[PDB]
Design a protein around this motif. Structure first.
Motif, PDB file in Angstrom:
ATOM      1  N   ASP A 482       8.017  -8.614  -0.732  1.00 45.58           N
ATOM      2  CA  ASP A 482       8.221  -9.541  -1.369  1.00 45.58           C
ATOM      3  C   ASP A 482       9.682 -10.395  -1.391  1.00 45.58           C
ATOM      4  N   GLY A 483      10.381  -9.989  -0.045  1.00 41.65           N
ATOM      5  CA  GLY A 483      11.551 -10.382   0.017  1.00 41.65           C
ATOM      6  C   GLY A 483      11.560 -11.894   0.910  1.00 41.65           C
ATOM      7  N   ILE A 484      12.464 -12.553   0.685  1.00 45.08           N
ATOM      8  CA  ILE A 484      12.375 -13.635   1.476  1.00 45.08           C
ATOM      9  C   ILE A 484      12.469 -13.334   2.856  1.00 45.08           C
ATOM     10  N   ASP A 485      12.030 -14.431   3.816  1.00 46.67           N
ATOM     11  CA  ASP A 485      12.240 -13.961   5.266  1.00 46.67           C
ATOM     12  C   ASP A 485      13.643 -14.089   5.765  1.00 46.67           C
ATOM     13  N   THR A 486      14.119 -13.178   6.386  1.00 47.69           N
ATOM     14  CA  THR A 486      15.549 -12.533   6.856  1.00 47.69           C
ATOM     15  C   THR A 486      15.781 -13.105   8.182  1.00 47.69           C
ATOM     16  N   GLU A 487      14.677 -13.315   8.904  1.00 46.96           N
ATOM     17  CA  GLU A 487      14.990 -13.473  10.372  1.00 46.96           C
ATOM     18  C   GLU A 487      15.914 -14.565  10.530  1.00 46.96           C
ATOM     19  N   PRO A 488      16.755 -14.406  11.603  1.00 47.02           N
ATOM     20  CA  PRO A 488      17.695 -15.500  11.741  1.00 47.02           C
ATOM     21  C   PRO A 488      17.326 -16.978  11.989  1.00 47.02           C
ATOM     22  N   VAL A 489      16.118 -17.131  12.727  1.00 50.77           N
ATOM     23  CA  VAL A 489      15.349 -18.273  13.072  1.00 50.77           C
ATOM     24  C   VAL A 489      14.995 -18.903  11.708  1.00 50.77           C
ATOM     25  N   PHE A 490      14.840 -18.458  10.554  1.00 47.13           N
ATOM     26  CA  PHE A 490      14.703 -18.971   9.497  1.00 47.13           C
ATOM     27  C   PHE A 490      15.886 -19.683   8.773  1.00 47.13           C
TER      28      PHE A 490
END
Lengths: 691, 173
Positions: A482-490
């Motif tokens: 349930d965490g936000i998307d943390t990939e750098p591309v976002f």
């Protein structure tokens, strides 16, 4: 009954008739003259307990104890050694996932190690019960422990590593940038994400697949709808030069048609009364393999090997404290509809007291050998790689015990993103590091998603996580479902670029990091080190925890606050500011001048990506490819012929040029204060001179 | 917290009258301090020093008061100020708080950072009662265990307090 043996600076003290969690060979076990008194120890055997006492002076430092959510100097606390699923752990919470019953005492600048080889609930009371004493309580009637002479902290760790096992040498890609989540799926989304990451300039070494890839959380299975064609996914990742690491828990589902359950029958854990120990885990009703047995380990290696044969590159061992949820779920069933709040007792997630194992053919209670469970599971998993003839081994484990370094990397578990966590993670990874487990890291960006209010998902904090772990051996981004998307591309361009540069900087330093990894696997020296490791004679160093050494040469003072600049404490000696070239005299406090405060001490040789080399002062260094490099008397010597792209020399005295192998003069360019660069671009037979 | 008070059936004998604890509770520390003060008189001890945690109107006749088991944190700096000033404006002049915070490490919300510790020393610079106190499981907070950088800051602050001591003591008079 008391026996003491001595062997190359290591005293093995045997109390009663011990039955160790694991047996460590003792080269030449020879009787000793040394008495308990001359060792400064007092021992007492009581009701199925052994109490070992040592005095504790005001200035004496106590370090070690592995993964502890406390200050590096352990004084004034009673620590419990018992692997447990810590949940959303906070600082000062004890115990955690890993148990390394080793502490080092530094008195008058001299280091001495104390290793108690018991995987039971060992208690380390460091000046708490008695202000002037370290009282160790082992809940067994017998025990074997070791007094490891120094005098340097490094000496203690070398001997300790020799005793419990040298860290395995993992492949270089294991130290690359890893992306992970709980979880990434279906299989097409995994590849889509990798493509976007690569397309935007992020060099991804590997992708971790969490429990959603399994069919009903059953080990060694692929979800029929999310992962229809696993070999297609594996080929797609491999052609993109990305590794695949799959999580593997320890719970075998009690299922009539589940192969591992049927083939594992006879090798599972039991309870005192004779039945199988049936508990609860991700798969639901589950049983657990008794890894203390050789046949269980052989059976598990077979499954791992077969799982690896599909092309899976690494194994991520989780929940192996070992953890079980039957007791917690039981409490919820009974007190379900009661408008009350349950106290969160983490110990409830350990195996119940009636569980038994068969260690070396002997039947033992779980509570006596608990902490070694992950050690044996990792051992069996490692054997799985050997069975597959896989030279490049990668195993990640959550829990551990002394010796776990032989088989796996360790990450700090389910951390909560927050500014305070930056400091906590540092203490955790350094605690592990100074305790014999070199390959460590934390979840970049924090694991916890959004299931409670005290979670900080701000983007500038995320960047600081990437920056904090810049030189950590294990570099992975992981997030809860349930965490936000943390990939750098976002991330918005502003923050995306910052992460991109940090990752590129890590890859620039990868050759140095990997060389230190080699050093770790050969000598047992940790990769990242608390400052007191290199300067144990300076008491001030035991209070510095927002700074760490990367090997013997690099000091990194990560910015762990909202501020743009921080105060940096420099140990004795001269230090070179990596970014502006300023050289400063040690044993002082200066202000940082860049977002990533990096300093090279006088006497450093640093290998960088693309055959680049940085030399400052005199020292001797062994690169990961076995090439030895020496700097001394204005001469840089190489044990063999190696290519050199760019050479950067930091020097207070000016450099006008360099001579390659006595016969080729190369012009030098001063780029900034105390910094000289030479574009060599060629093979050096054996030496470079500075004029 | 009220569970830690004396139960409702406790009684005392005040001036020849049997009274319920709940009617005179708050004055208990006053009378204990009074008896202790009398102890000094009995010893013909002129230099008297008595520290009390609890109190009631009149407690100033016999003792200093410190703010109890505070938790080290940046917010506590402001809280302590309100506490000592609250006491001060209410007739109890000799007050202070535990420099560095009492709580050790028995829960997560405890800030043991060194720059905060220095700010505690600085905060209490002119407080009448200047004491460093820590719980059993807290880190060692004595200045001598601090890195040179922070040790010197505390040292200067303490020296500054002693420089102003004559003024502080004159105000005590």
């Amino acid at each position: 009954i008391l026996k003491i043996y001595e062997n190359k600076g290591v005293y093995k003290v045997v109390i009663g008739e011990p039955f160790p969690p694991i047996e460590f060979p003792l080269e030449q076990k020879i009787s000793s003259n040394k008495s308990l008194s001359e060792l400064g120890l007092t021992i007492v055997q009581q009701g199925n307990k052994v109490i070992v006492e040592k005095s504790l002076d005001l200035k004496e430092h106590i370090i070690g104890l592995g993964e502890k959510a406390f200050e590096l100097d352990r004084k004034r606390k009673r620590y419990v050694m018992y692997n447990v699923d810590a949940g959303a752990y906070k600082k000062y919470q004890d115990p955690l996932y890993v148990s390394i019953p080793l502490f080092i005492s530094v008195k008058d600048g001299v280091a001495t190690g104390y290793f108690f080889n018991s995987a039971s609930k060992v208690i380390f009371d460091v000046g708490l019960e008695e202000y002037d004493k370290v009282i160790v309580t082992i809940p067994e009637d017998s025990v074997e422990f070791y007094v490891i002479e120094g005098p340097r902290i490094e000496d203690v760790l070398e001997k300790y590593t020799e005793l419990t096992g040298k860290p395995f040498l993992p492949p270089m890609w294991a130290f690359g940038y890893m992306i992970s989540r709980y979880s990434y799926y279906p299989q097409d989304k995994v590849v889509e994400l990798v493509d976007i990451m690569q397309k935007e300039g992020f060099r991804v070494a590997g992708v971790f697949l969490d429990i959603h890839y399994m069919d009903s959380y059953k080990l060694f299975t692929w979800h029929p709808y999310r992962f229809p064609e696993p070999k297609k996914l594996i080929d797609e990742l491999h052609k993109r030069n990305v590794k695949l690491i799959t999580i593997v828990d320890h719970g075998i589902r009690v299922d009539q048609n589940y192969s591992p359950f049927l083939s594992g029958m006879g090798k599972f854990c039991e309870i005192e009364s004779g039945e199988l120990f049936v508990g609860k885990m991700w798969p639901g009703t589950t049983v657990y393999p008794d890894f203390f047995r050789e046949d269980t380990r052989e059976w598990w290696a077979g499954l791992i090997s077969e799982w690896l044969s599909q092309g899976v590159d690494g194994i991520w061992l989780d929940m192996n404290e070992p953890t079980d949820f039957s007791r917690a779920i039981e409490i919820r069933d009974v007190l379900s509809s009661l408008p009350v709040q349950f106290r969160d007792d983490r110990l409830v997630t350990t195996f119940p007291d009636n569980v038994v194992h068969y260690l070396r053919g002997k039947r033992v209670k779980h509570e006596k050998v608990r902490n070694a469970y992950p050690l044996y599971e990792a051992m069996a998993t490692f054997k799985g790689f050997r069975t597959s003839h896989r030279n490049e081994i990668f195993i990640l484990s959550r829990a551990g015990y002394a010796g776990i370094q032989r088989y796996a990397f360790i990450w700090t578990g389910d951390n909560t993103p927050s500014w305070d966590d930056l400091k906590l993670q540092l203490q955790l990874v350094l605690g592990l590091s100074i305790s014999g487990v070199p390959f460590v890291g934390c979840d970049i960006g924090g694991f916890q998603g959004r299931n409670f209010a005290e979670i900080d998902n701000s983007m500038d904090l995320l960047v600081k996580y990437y920056a904090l772990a810049l030189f950590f051996p294990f570099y992975r981004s992981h997030k809860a479902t349930d965490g936000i998307d943390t990939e750098p591309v976002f991330l918005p361009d502003y923050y995306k670029e910052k992460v991109k540069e940090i990752v590129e900087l890590r890859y620039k330093f990868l050759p140095y990091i990997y060389s230190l990894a080699l050093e770790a696997s050969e000598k047992g020296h940790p990769v990242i080190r608390p400052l007191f490791y290199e300067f144990q004679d300076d008491d001030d160093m035991y209070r510095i925890e927002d700074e760490y050494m990367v090997g013997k040469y690099l000091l990194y003072a990560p910015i762990v606050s909202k501020e743009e600049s921080r105060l940096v404490t420099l140990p004795r000696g001269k230090w070179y500011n990596y970014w502006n070239g300023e050289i400063i005299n040690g044993k002082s406090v200066v202000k940082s001048t860049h977002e990533l405060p990096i300093y090279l001490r006088e006497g450093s040789i640093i290998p960088l990506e693309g055959d680049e080399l940085i030399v400052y002062g005199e020292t001797s260094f062994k690169r990961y490819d076995n090439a030895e490099i020496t700097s001394s008397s204005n001469e840089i010597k190489f044990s063999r012929e190696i290519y050199v792209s760019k050479l950067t020399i930091t020097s207070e005295k000016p450099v006008s040029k360099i001579i390659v192998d006595d016969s080729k003069e190369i012009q030098v360019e001063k780029t900034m204060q105390n910094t000289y660069v030479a574009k060599i671009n060629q093979k050096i037979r054996g030496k470079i001179n500075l004029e």
